[PDB]
Design a protein around this nucleic acid. Sequence first.
RNA 1: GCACCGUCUAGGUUGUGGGUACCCAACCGUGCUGUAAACUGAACCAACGGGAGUUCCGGAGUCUUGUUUCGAGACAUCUGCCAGAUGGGGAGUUUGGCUG
RNA 2: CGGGUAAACGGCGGGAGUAACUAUGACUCUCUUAAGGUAGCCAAAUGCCUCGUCUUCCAAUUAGAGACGCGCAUGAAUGGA
RNA 3: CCAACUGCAGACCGUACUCAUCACCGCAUCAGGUCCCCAAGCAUAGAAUGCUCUGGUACAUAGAGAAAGGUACACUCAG
RNA 4: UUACUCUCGCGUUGUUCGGAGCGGGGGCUCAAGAUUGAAAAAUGCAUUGUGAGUUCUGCGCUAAAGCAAAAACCUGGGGU
RNA 5: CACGAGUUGUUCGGAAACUGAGCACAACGUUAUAUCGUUUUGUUAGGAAAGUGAAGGAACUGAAAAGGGGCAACAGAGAACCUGGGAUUAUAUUCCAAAAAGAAAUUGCAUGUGGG
RNA 6: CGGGGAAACCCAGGUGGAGGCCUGUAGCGAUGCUGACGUGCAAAUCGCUCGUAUGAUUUGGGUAUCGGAGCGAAAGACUCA
Lengths: 88, 255, 68
Amino acid sequence: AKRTVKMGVMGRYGTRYGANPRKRAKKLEVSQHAKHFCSFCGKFAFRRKAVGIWRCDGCSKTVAGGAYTLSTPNNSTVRSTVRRLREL
Amino acid sequence: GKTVLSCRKGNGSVYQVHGHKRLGPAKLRILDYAERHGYMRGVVKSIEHEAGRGAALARVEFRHPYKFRRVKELMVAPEGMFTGQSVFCGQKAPLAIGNVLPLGQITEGCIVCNVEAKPGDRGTLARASGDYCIIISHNHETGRTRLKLPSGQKKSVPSTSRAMIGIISGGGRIEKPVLKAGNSFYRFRGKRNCWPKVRGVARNPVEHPHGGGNHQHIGHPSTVSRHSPPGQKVGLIAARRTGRIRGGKAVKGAW
Amino acid sequence: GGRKRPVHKGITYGKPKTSGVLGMKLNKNNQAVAEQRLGKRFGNLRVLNSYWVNMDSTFKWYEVIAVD
RNA sequence: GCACCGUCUAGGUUGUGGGUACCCAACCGUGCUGUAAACUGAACCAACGGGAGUUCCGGAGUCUUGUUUCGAGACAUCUGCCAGAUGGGGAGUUUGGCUG
RNA sequence: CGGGUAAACGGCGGGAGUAACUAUGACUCUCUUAAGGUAGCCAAAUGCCUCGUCUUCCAAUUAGAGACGCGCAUGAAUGGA
RNA sequence: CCAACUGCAGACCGUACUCAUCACCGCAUCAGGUCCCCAAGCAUAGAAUGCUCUGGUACAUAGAGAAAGGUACACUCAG
RNA sequence: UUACUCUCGCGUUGUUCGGAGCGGGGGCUCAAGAUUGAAAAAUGCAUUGUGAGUUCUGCGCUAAAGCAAAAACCUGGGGU
RNA sequence: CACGAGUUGUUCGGAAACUGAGCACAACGUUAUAUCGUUUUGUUAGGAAAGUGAAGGAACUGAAAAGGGGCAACAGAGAACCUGGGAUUAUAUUCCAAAAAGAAAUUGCAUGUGGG
RNA sequence: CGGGGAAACCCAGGUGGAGGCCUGUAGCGAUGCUGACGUGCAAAUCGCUCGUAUGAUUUGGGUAUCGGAGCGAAAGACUCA
Ligand SMILES: [K+]
Ligand SMILES: [K+]
Ligand SMILES: [K+]
Ligand SMILES: [Mg+2]
Ligand SMILES: [Mg+2]
Ligand SMILES: [Mg+2]
Ligand SMILES: [Mg+2]
Ligand SMILES: [Mg+2]
Ligand SMILES: [Mg+2]
Ligand SMILES: [Mg+2]
Ligand SMILES: [Mg+2]
Ligand SMILES: [Mg+2]
Ligand SMILES: [Mg+2]
Ligand SMILES: [Mg+2]
Ligand SMILES: [Mg+2]
Ligand SMILES: [Mg+2]
Ligand SMILES: [Mg+2]
Ligand SMILES: [Mg+2]
Ligand SMILES: [Mg+2]
Ligand SMILES: [Mg+2]
Ligand SMILES: [Mg+2]
Ligand SMILES: [Mg+2]
Ligand SMILES: [Mg+2]
Ligand SMILES: [Mg+2]
Ligand SMILES: [Mg+2]
Ligand SMILES: [Mg+2]
Ligand SMILES: [Mg+2]
Ligand SMILES: [Mg+2]
Ligand SMILES: [Mg+2]
Ligand SMILES: [Mg+2]
Ligand SMILES: [Mg+2]
Ligand SMILES: [Mg+2]
Ligand SMILES: [Mg+2]
Ligand SMILES: [Mg+2]
Ligand SMILES: [Mg+2]
Ligand SMILES: [Mg+2]
Ligand SMILES: [Mg+2]
Ligand SMILES: [Mg+2]
Ligand SMILES: [Mg+2]
Ligand SMILES: [Mg+2]
Ligand SMILES: [Mg+2]
Ligand SMILES: [Mg+2]
Ligand code: NA
Ligand code: NA
Ligand code: NA
Ligand SMILES: [Zn+2]
């Protein structure tokens, strides 16, 4: 059965640090422990080691990007801009 | 009275950098003949974390231009760099993420990082995680380039200065609340002896200008002159304004 | 230049008459200072005399005669 | 006014094995043999040619009114000396008498 | 000299008249400030008078709790609830 | 030159004892303080607590002995 | 190797693995053990089977915290 | 208290011979005055700090290679030995003598044997 | 892994071992008795009781910062009674 109603992984904090601060940290906590898609190879096997460092279980490849997610939204825009300027 | 803590920190002593675990300074390649006239190609070998720094570092291997040996460089890694990637540095390098080009060869409106303030300085601007600079315009007659800095200010630099294409990796660090005193303890362990902080009004008059009184209060305005001597220049130093900011926030810094 | 009194942080004690830090002058001239420097450095020689040779904004230069 | 210092150049224009496919001269260019999204190879102590066994040249251009190079620049915290403001950051000292 | 700035140091009012029993004043005049204490809260660890007044708790309570407010001298990051 | 074999030679300093309710600091053989290693049986959840084989010890001024009043890691009391 | 064709299969106490090659047959190699002997009975004192504990070892390797360096030694690439 | 005795190492610990937080000789600068400062972010000093591989005909002579000389860990790195003894009054992985009670490992230099 | 649902999803049983989590030794401290002692065992100790005990934890050796100064999660605390 389901073990908590609202707080999944923040349940280790008990009743301490306040509802809103716990809520904001939960979104980033879930992201930094999930498995992200690897463009090299084809597997969902990217795991964060340290802040900004991601390693693929299958590829055994290391990529630099994002404190809590593999790719930041600002990075996606920059790649498109650079590609467009190169094609000029 | 006795010496204030801010003045005491200037002696060094127990307030210096904790640098035993650090890998060394991070910098670009040396601006040499090959970089000035052609290009050099290197290979990214590893991506690592350094204590006290939020951005990831990259080790890049090149061939020595004059001798039979290999050269290893430690640089601040832009987002998206991966092991096994090829990096081109020099005048004739193509425009791609991770390459290092002179500013005069980069199209206007581009996003850059690790920018040299002066030619050959090996990178001094836009180095913290998630930061970048924007190219505004070129001046071919004067041979200069205009840049917008992360703080919002605008600066003109010689077009010979180099820059790396992309943004610094590790962005989004400060969006997560810390929630615990121990987390701050571990955060500052890798940096220096500056935490926790004791309020000035909680000290005694012998140590701080704000100390003393039968209530915790400052008895005089906390805005102090630019000409105040050390030991008196505490509080809000040479403030142009105070209070909550209404409307747009102005750009900080000098004229 | 003039002599700066070597007290910690420019703080003097006692009567106000002895409180100057920057406006005092040494009671001995630079030619004698130069001769004494050379004599203390090279102990196997005997100093005889000296003379002014050149001068600029920061430095003065003297030539010192010594015998063995 | 004329001589001398005082000259060179990449590139562009005009059925299997072993080989050939130039030279013009002039302008452009300015020291150029490699890449033009990327995803982990190697490269050192000369091959060869020419002039008189062993040299000396070329391969690997020559020259220096001389600055290691880049950015500023006779301004400038750049040096020293005079002068004026500010200055509890700091030092020294004082903070009367009579008095149910 | 002339501008800006309070999450800078800080500050944030008095007099009389007035409704079909009386009482009280929604209302109207008057002197005045840089501005005249807003939302809230209270005899509170902040109320002199004071063991304030009403209710509850006990056989009996200068104690406790809940209310009321002209608050000697409550009050908003000198942070209020 | 390389492999076993064989022959000869292997220098200097430390080494007793203690590590604590008597060997160190506290004026002292002071109920204070002082880092590390090995850790048996039964009860029991057990490195709690109680008792025990091996090892260690009987060293702390003692004898006689129901005053009042005391101290106690000693108790009990009708309504 | 039509292994995942239409509920695919192997495996741990456990948070997973496979056309970038699962499972089955046959092999190569590493780590920790077991067994046979020399030592070794010539010594010591006057026996070989199960359960419980035990960090050597193996199970390959919270974090805005990601876990020292060098001497010495080993192997290779070239050359002789 | 008095007199007389007792501590045995190729392998145990240290040093010879590592580096760390760090120290500060030389060098340079400063100070009336060195008894002051700099001296590991690959690293001294306006800074000429390298003294021998091979050679070449048996001692000489000189190519190469940037960044002077040291110290700081008896719990980090490193480190070739084990049992038995009837062997003391007191020492022992340190003593035991030809049947070393005995069995090993390792360093330096030489001599055969075999191979090249 | 069982049940329900057109779908989004919902209900139930196991496994696992997180936390500046809780009871509690060693350790690190010091709330009350305003206990003992108060020419002491002691120029700050003793007994019971008590706080915490995987962390902002405790501890050995080495090393760095001092007297018009050093250091201080701030008591004018500490710098060989
Ligand atoms: K601190
Ligand atoms: K004050
Ligand atoms: K106070
Ligand atoms: Mg430092
Ligand atoms: Mg205080
Ligand atoms: Mg003061
Ligand atoms: Mg306050
Ligand atoms: Mg003041
Ligand atoms: Mg002077
Ligand atoms: Mg004086
Ligand atoms: Mg002199
Ligand atoms: Mg110049
Ligand atoms: Mg004063
Ligand atoms: Mg009000
Ligand atoms: Mg009130
Ligand atoms: Mg009562
Ligand atoms: Mg009340
Ligand atoms: Mg306000
Ligand atoms: Mg107040
Ligand atoms: Mg002994
Ligand atoms: Mg002991
Ligand atoms: Mg005793
Ligand atoms: Mg004792
Ligand atoms: Mg039982
Ligand atoms: Mg016990
Ligand atoms: Mg027990
Ligand atoms: Mg006694
Ligand atoms: Mg006895
Ligand atoms: Mg009695
Ligand atoms: Mg009774
Ligand atoms: Mg299958
Ligand atoms: Mg004696
Ligand atoms: Mg004797
Ligand atoms: Mg330094
Ligand atoms: Mg060091
Ligand atoms: Mg050195
Ligand atoms: Mg050791
Ligand atoms: Mg040894
Ligand atoms: Mg003994
Ligand atoms: Mg607890
Ligand atoms: Mg008492
Ligand atoms: Mg006080
Ligand atoms: Na380091
Ligand atoms: Na003075
Ligand atoms: Na638990
Ligand atoms: Zn991958």
